[PDB]
Amino acid sequence: ERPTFYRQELNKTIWEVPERYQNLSPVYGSVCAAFDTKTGLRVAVKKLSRPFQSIIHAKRTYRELRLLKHMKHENVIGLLDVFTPARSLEEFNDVYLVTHLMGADLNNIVKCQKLTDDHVQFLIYQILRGLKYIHSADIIHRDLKPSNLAVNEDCELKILDFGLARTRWYRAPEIMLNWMHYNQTVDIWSVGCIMAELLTGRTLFPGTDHIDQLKLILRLVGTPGAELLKKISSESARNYIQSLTQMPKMNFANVFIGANPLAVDLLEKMLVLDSDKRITAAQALAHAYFAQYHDPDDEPVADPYDQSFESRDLLIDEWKSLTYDEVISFVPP
Numbered sequence: 001e002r003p004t005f006y007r008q009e010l011n012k013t014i015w016e017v018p019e020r021y022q023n024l025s026p027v028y029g030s031v032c033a034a035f036d037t038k039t040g041l042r043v044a045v046k047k048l049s050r051p052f053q054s055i056i057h058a059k060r061t062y063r064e065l066r067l068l069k070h071m072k073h074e075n076v077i078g079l080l081d082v083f084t085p086a087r088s089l090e091e092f093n094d095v096y097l098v099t100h101l102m103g104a105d106l107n108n109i110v111k112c113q114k115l116t117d118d119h120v121q122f123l124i125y126q127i128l129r130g131l132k133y134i135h136s137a138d139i140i141h142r143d144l145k146p147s148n149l150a151v152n153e154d155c156e157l158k159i160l161d162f163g164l165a166r167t168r169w170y171r172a173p174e175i176m177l178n179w180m181h182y183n184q185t186v187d188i189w190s191v192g193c194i195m196a197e198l199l200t201g202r203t204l205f206p207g208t209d210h211i212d213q214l215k216l217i218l219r220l221v222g223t224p225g226a227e228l229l230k231k232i233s234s235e236s237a238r239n240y241i242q243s244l245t246q247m248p249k250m251n252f253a254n255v256f257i258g259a260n261p262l263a264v265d266l267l268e269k270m271l272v273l274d275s276d277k278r279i280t281a282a283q284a285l286a287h288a289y290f291a292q293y294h295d296p297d298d299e300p301v302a303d304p305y306d307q308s309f310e311s312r313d314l315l316i317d318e319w320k321s322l323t324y325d326e327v328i329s330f331v332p333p
């Protein structure tokens with residue numbers, strides 16, 4: 001039961017999409033905003049770039065599609081559709097993924113603007129809820145930031161681009177210097193930088209380079225204590241820390257002047273150097289800063305997700321064909 005595609009040489013790249021998708025307006029892939037005719041609903045259409053013209057892209061293509069098909073949560077971007085103009089696995093070299101189009105990202109909401117505590121509470125609460133879900137399926141975002149967080153006019157939020165990362169202002173210090181083995185709280189640190197910027201209106205750690213980034217982070221969290229350093233195996237990481245000039249951790253109360261007391265408590269719990277001791281998503285959800293929204297019975301986790309392919313070393317065409325299977329087997333929500 002195929003459909004009828006049309007061609008749009010607009011962008012500097014050719015778009016070949018189904019009839020229902022009209023008024024393509026451009027906005028690892030090029031994305032267009034478009035108007036779905038079948039639903040009168042505005043969507044986001046993504047054309048994957050050279051999905052199968054390199055082994056890394058091939059695997060990433062398969063990875064992104066599996067994740068989108070499996071993830072069903074109100075705070076995690078969902079897949080409306082996936083298609084290709086190709087009529088056979090031999091013709092397949094293009095992949096399109098369609099999503100809901102939201103009104104704005106977080107990069108603009110705080111665009112030189114301070115929010116209200118309730119606004120912040122609600123935004124951060126949804127990130128944590130969507131994060132708990134993703135983390136439960138054993139997926140980590142890795143590059144969470146204002147731009148991949150999509151919000152609509154009613155402040156309802158969805159997480160974008162998770163699990164692909166397998167733009168320095170939101171990365172955990174341990175994932176930046178490559179020291180102490182990282183865990184899921186790497187996303188918790190990003191949330192910290194985002195929640196802070198949401199309350200203050202300014203970028204928490206607005207670095208100008210890798211080295212200068214660690215500077216700012218350490219200016220606030222203070223240099224790693226003996227407890228942390230003793231757990232750091234990397235010699236190169238140890239040489240760097242031991243070479244820095246000692247610095248005390250600041251009191252977040254005298255940093256986040258005026259913010260709701262509990263906000264500062266949650267913050268302090270999120271912006272910790274010790275990944276071992278950083279609060280988790282599920283744990284941050286139970287925090288009192290969220291008593292108005294917290295609901296232990298409406299904070300779902302993900303059904304088991306088979307990721308074994310991650311340990312696969314296949315050929316481009318093997319990845320290509322597996323994707324083709326995911327494409328044709330797709331059924332809309």
Ligand SMILES: CCNC(=O)c1cn2ncnc(Nc3cc(C(=O)NOC)ccc3C)c2c1C
Pocket residue numbers: 031044045046064067068077097098099100101102103104105150151159160161162163164
């Ligand atoms: C607030 C205004 N902006 C938007 O609505 C908006 C802006 N973009 N930009 C890029 N991609 C978007 N969606 C998307 C995300 C993934 C994905 O997340 N796969 O990675 C696991 C896959 C395909 C698509 C189409 C997107 C949306 C929905």
